[PDB]
């Protein structure tokens, strides 16, 4: 059975402009396990680290992608996910709020 990925984006610590922090992209509930996850800065790829592949009690997969970032009123950050069940790469923007 095929299941689409769910995506959430969030910061490790309370965001504060100009203050170093981590941006997390959590992608879960998906099947099969092949997947491409990239965090983005203004629609462009920054270096991130990706957890080892794992799965939940119902067998659906999850991954945590995370990177250092410094938020500010100007820059936009997002997470971009490529999966066989997605016609086009899905982008979820960091909504600080």
């Amino acid at each position: 059975i095929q299941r689409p990925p769910k995506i959430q984006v969030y910061s490790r610590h309370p965001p504060e402009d100009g203050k170093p922090n981590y941006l997390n992209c959590y992608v879960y509930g998906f099947h099969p396990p092949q997947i491409e996850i990239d965090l983005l800065k203004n629609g462009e790829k920054i270096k991130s680290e990706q957890s080892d592949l794992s799965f939940s009690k119902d067998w659906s997969f999850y991954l945590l992608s995370h990177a250092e970032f410094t938020p500010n009123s100007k820059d936009q950050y997002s997470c971009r996910v490529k999966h066989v069940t997605l016609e086009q790469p899905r982008i979820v923007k960091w909504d600080r709020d």
């Binding site: 490790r12 309370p14 680290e49 794992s54 799965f55 945590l64 909504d95 709020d97």
Partner: protein, 275 residues
């Protein structure tokens, strides 16, 4: 009241793409905390924590590693050869967890297997039980395990003898870290406007450890019934992040607060006021 994880599991993810291409990914976990990685090519374990070997000797760990390395190689070969017999069609994913779990008192053990993302079999108490949906293919597999008594005996040993010992040893070895109390950071924001005259009030709770937590929107003392419990999501440092949301009228947001209860805080909840 017992703090931190109560279970250990080996985890296998095996992808079969075609007659010549298959991939295994392996790891070891205490509940949802990874304590082992696995380098597939060489069949090398990665000891993520100072206490990842629990109370086991190096020689015992090495034997177990040699064993898992041989297993992956054999598992792959066997599935490849039996693709037609079990009428499997490429591409296909097999998932396996094997390990054991504390229950307030006798430790329980089992191996669970999945195919195509669905319950396929479970193996416990020197018995194979195919999942109710697994069909003839399930019954065939269980029949097969009785042709493989050596492999079955190794697995039952691992489940009933080795694992209970390992779990108790490793909870003791990593006790300080596994039962540490880390206080959450909390903050409020207002999310994307959901409709005319309404606010999305979001309470963010991050960095707490252990996992159990209770976050609730309040007005004074009354719990708000609109409170939306987000899912626990992991951070990269063995803590978790949670969003708790409230969809409320704009002229009613005044006097609301988010109440955070967590074991690290004792009886004094953290409170955050909206204004």
């Amino acid at each position: 009241v017992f703090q931190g994880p109560t279970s250990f599991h080996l985890m296998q993810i095996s992808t079969f793409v075609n007659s010549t291409w298959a991939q295994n990914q392996g790891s070891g976990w205490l509940d949802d905390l990874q304590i082992h990685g696995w380098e597939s090519d060489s069949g090398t374990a990665i000891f993520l924590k100072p206490w990842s070997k629990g109370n086991f000797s190096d020689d015992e760990v090495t034997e177990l590693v040699d064993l898992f390395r041989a297993y992956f190689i054999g598992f792959t070969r066997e599935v490849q050869d039996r693709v037609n017999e079990f009428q499997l069609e490429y591409p296909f994913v097999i998932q396996v967890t094997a390990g054991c779990e504390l229950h307030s008192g006798a430790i329980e053990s089992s191996l669970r297997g999945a195919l195509g993302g669905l319950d396929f079999v479970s193996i416990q108490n020197h018995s194979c039980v195919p999942a109710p949906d697994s069909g003839s293919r399930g019954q065939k597999f269980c029949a097969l395990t009785t042709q493989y008594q050596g492999i079955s005996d190794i697995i039952e040993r691992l489940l009933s003898e080795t694992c209970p010992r390992y779990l108790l040893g490793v909870l003791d070895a990593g006790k300080a870290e596994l039962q540490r109390q880390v206080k959450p950071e909390a903050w409020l924001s207002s999310g994307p406007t959901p409709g005319p005259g309404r606010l999305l009030l979001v309470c963010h709770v991050s960095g707490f450890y252990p996992k159990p937590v209770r976050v609730m929107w309040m007005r004074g003392e009354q719990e708000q019934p609109g409170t939306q419990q987000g899912d626990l999501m992991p951070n990269a440092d063995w803590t978790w992040y949670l969003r708790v949301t409230l969809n409320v009228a704009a002229g009613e947001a005044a006097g609301l607060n988010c109440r955070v209860k967590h074991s690290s805080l004792g009886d004094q909840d953290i409170i955050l006021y909206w204004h």
